Amino acid sequence: MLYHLFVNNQVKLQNDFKPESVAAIRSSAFNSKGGTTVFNFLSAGENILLHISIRPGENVIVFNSRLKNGAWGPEERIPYAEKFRPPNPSITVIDHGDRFQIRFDYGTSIYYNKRIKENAAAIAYNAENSLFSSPVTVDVHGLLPPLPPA
Amino acid sequence: MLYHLFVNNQVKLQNDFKPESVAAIRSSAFNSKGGTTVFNFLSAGENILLHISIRPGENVIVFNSRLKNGAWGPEERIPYAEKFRPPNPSITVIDHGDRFQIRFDYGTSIYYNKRIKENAAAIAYNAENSLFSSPVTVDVHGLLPPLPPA
Amino acid sequence: MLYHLFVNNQVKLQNDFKPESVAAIRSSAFNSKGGTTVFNFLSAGENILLHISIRPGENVIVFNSRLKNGAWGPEERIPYAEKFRPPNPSITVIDHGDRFQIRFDYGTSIYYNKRIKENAAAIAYNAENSLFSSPVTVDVHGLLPPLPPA
Amino acid sequence: MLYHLFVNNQVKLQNDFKPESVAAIRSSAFNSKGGTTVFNFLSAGENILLHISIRPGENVIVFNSRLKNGAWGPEERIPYAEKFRPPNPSITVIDHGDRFQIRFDYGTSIYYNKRIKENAAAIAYNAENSLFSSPVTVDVHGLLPPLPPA
Numbered sequence: 001m002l003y004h005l006f007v008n009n010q011v012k013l014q015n016d017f018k019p020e021s022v023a024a025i026r027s028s029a030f031n032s033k034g035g036t037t038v039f040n041f042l043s044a045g046e047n048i049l050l051h052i053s054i055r056p057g058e059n060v061i062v063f064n065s066r067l068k069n070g071a072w073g074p075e076e077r078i079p080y081a082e083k084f085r086p087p088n089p090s091i092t093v094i095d096h097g098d099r100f101q102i103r104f105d106y107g108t109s110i111y112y113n114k115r116i117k118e119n120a121a122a123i124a125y126n127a128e129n130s131l132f133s134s135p136v137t138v139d140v141h142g143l144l145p146p147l148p149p150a
Numbered sequence: 151m152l153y154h155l156f157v158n159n160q161v162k163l164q165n166d167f168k169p170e171s172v173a174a175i176r177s178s179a180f181n182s183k184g185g186t187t188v189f190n191f192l193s194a195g196e197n198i199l200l201h202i203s204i205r206p207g208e209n210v211i212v213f214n215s216r217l218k219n220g221a222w223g224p225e226e227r228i229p230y231a232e233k234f235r236p237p238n239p240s241i242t243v244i245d246h247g248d249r250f251q252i253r254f255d256y257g258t259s260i261y262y263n264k265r266i267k268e269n270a271a272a273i274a275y276n277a278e279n280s281l282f283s284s285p286v287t288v289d290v291h292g293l294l295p296p297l298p299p300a
Numbered sequence: 301m302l303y304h305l306f307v308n309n310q311v312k313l314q315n316d317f318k319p320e321s322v323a324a325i326r327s328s329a330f331n332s333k334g335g336t337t338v339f340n341f342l343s344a345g346e347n348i349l350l351h352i353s354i355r356p357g358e359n360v361i362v363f364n365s366r367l368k369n370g371a372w373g374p375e376e377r378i379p380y381a382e383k384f385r386p387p388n389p390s391i392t393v394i395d396h397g398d399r400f401q402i403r404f405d406y407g408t409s410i411y412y413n414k415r416i417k418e419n420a421a422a423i424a425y426n427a428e429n430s431l432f433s434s435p436v437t438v439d440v441h442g443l444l445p446p447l448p449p450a
Numbered sequence: 451m452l453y454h455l456f457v458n459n460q461v462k463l464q465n466d467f468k469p470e471s472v473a474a475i476r477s478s479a480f481n482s483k484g485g486t487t488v489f490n491f492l493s494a495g496e497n498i499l500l501h502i503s504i505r506p507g508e509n510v511i512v513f514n515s516r517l518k519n520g521a522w523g524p525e526e527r528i529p530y531a532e533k534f535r536p537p538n539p540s541i542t543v544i545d546h547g548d549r550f551q552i553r554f555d556y557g558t559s560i561y562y563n564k565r566i567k568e569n570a571a572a573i574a575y576n577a578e579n580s581l582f583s584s585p586v587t588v589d590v591h592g593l594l595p596p597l598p599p600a
């Protein structure tokens with residue numbers, strides 16, 4: 001299923017993003033001078049199941065969760081440098097049931113254990129001076145598709 | 151290469167669309183009540199190498215070519231009914247040197263012999279009440295990529 | 301990388317099967333009357349990092365690990381029924397650093413935590429009356445490849 | 451549909467290779483010192499609809515056709531050099547209805563007009579000292595599948 005997720009907006013998923021589900025986020029540009037760019041996986045109740053904060057100017061990507069009206073939990077971080085590949089940087093999120101797998105263009109995957117057991121109903125995109133394009137292409141799968149030889 | 155082609159606009163390609171090149175056009179929605187939607191493959195000199203005019207009312211897809219300041223030549227048209235598949239309708243164009251191959255969601259491929267011997271420098275998208283999303287996700291290849299077993 | 305893994309034989313990998321690596325195993329046939337078929341991911345020192353024992357009669361798929369000259373540890377098994385899809389049954393293994401993820405044609409993914417902290421140097425295939433073809437087509441990736449929209 | 455086409459043998463297609471059909475041939479090796487290697491697309495009547503003769507020692511690839519007990523027609527040739535890419539060279543054949551498209555690893559595609567109007571029922575592989583592996587992996591499609599971004 002294809003979606004065009006615009007900045008400072010979101011897309012309501014046709015089906016719940018649940019275990020086995022794959023979200024392929026791809027940008028049609030890379031604005032090297034952009035600022036903090038955020039991507040949230042929200043539940044039907046608007047809880048933030050997976051928060052990804054891409055901070056170029058702090059050289060770190062922060063992962064967290066929080067309930068609609070709750071506080072943030074502990075931050076899980078990683079170096080921002082050499083993760084994205086211009087001109088079409090991408091982010092791939094896979095629900096492995098007990099945790100999420102987030103793969104960027106470079107480096108090994110980041111594993112985030114689930115903190116709020118609920119499936120995702122929507123994907124949000126927030127940033128004032130986005131690091132990526134608007135919209136970004138999002139192809140959500142019900143499961144891993146057949147893979148090409150390369 | 152990923153491009154986001156907004157309606158009544160166009161996208162300047164990073165490299166010429168030439169023989170062996172494949173353009174994968176995908177929309178995140180299908181507006182049944184949509185009007186006439188047009189996709190053009192333009193050359194550097196703005197010649198319309200391949201004109202794809204989708205007409206729901208008139209029930210046909212019309213293919214043509216035309217120089218920037220010239221007149222349209224004969225039309226090669228086909229039935230519009232049962233070509234697209236909602237919610238993510240698609241259009242794929244492949245350059246085979248002497249002719250273009252066009253493929254939709256349903257039916258067989260359509261072949262259109264080249265009339266203006268030039269490569270494409272940009273892809274246009276026009277519509278008053280587009281049949282598709284805005285923008286449309288467009289993936290351009292230099293050659294046919296590795297195929298999945300399914 | 302494409303390998304043809306013949307039965308009761310193995311294939312020496314061009315590069316270590318490590319975290320982020322994906323192995324796409326596919327058979328060109330399914331022999332219903334097949335017996336116990338085994339696939340092993342072996343380390344340079346011939347340790348059996350991941351043992352996949354498919355048992356049609358006993359109706360289960362058994363996962364285990366073992367040092368070259370050591371004894372098997374506890375078995376992590378699952379029901380065999382409705383896992384494969386003829387005529388081209390498949391098995392996919394992905395290394396996630398701390399555990400392996402196994403996927404068949406049907407059902408959800410299976411996760412097996414690593415027991416022997418070593419990378420795989422070869423992939424073995426054993427069977428008296430194999431359930432699959434000989435050889436089996438095997439595509440190994442360094443990282444997850446680009447995914448088709450479907 | 452997957453097939454394992456062994457040298458000096460063939461594979462009977464589950465379905466007729468006809469217009470829109472794609473055959474993806476991939477070798478798991480490249481024997482640079484190998485000799486002439488042949489791949490034939492045969493009809494149910496054993497007519498050779500598409501003959502591909504890969505001649506390294508003559509630096510040419512020859513295309514031809516002929517009926518089960520008929521003579522060869524005129525040869526359509528091309529340079530052999532820099533077409534295949536080790537260690538996993540490939541050949542892709544696509545039926546465009548009025549002609550075939552043959553793409554190797556490098557160079558533009560070769561277009562062969564059909565000479566015997568019949569669909570293919572089998573694919574043969576002949577060579578004394580093959581340039582490729584045995585078997586070769588063959589994934590035949592009923593039509594072009596969804597393409598990955600790269």
Ligand SMILES: OC[C@H]1O[C@@H](O[C@H]2[C@H](O)[C@@H](O)[C@H](O)O[C@@H]2CO)[C@H](O)[C@@H](O)[C@H]1O
Binds near residue numbers: 051063064073075
């Ligand atoms: O935890 C995610 C959350 O972080 C906020 O920023 C934190 C910052 O990381 C921390 O070092 C500082 O002490 O407190 C800030 C506020 O909690 C972001 O503002 C917010 O957008 C999320 O990304």
Ligand SMILES: OC[C@H]1O[C@@H](O[C@H]2[C@H](O)[C@@H](O)[C@H](O)O[C@@H]2CO)[C@H](O)[C@@H](O)[C@H]1O
Binds near residue numbers: 201212213214222225
């Ligand atoms: O042929 C492409 C061109 O068609 C124009 O419409 C045609 C119409 O299809 C034809 O039946 C009539 O005879 O002439 C019209 C004008 O030449 C479209 O208006 C134009 O945008 C192109 O799509």
Ligand SMILES: OC[C@H]1O[C@@H](O[C@H]2[C@H](O)[C@@H](O)[C@H](O)O[C@@H]2CO)[C@H](O)[C@@H](O)[C@H]1O
Binds near residue numbers: 351353374375
């Ligand atoms: O556990 C992997 C190992 O199993 C052996 O068979 C086991 C059998 O599954 C178990 O029920 C019994 O208690 O012990 C047997 C031998 O330890 C297989 O023979 C061996 O090949 C591996 O597959």
Ligand SMILES: OC[C@H]1O[C@@H](O[C@H]2[C@H](O)[C@@H](O)[C@H](O)O[C@@H]2CO)[C@H](O)[C@@H](O)[C@H]1O
Binds near residue numbers: 501512525
């Ligand atoms: O035409 C395909 C056919 O060619 C045969 O070889 C030809 C050769 O190409 C030509 O130059 C010579 O004059 O005659 C030979 C016999 O026709 C191959 O022997 C045969 O296998 C096919 O590849």
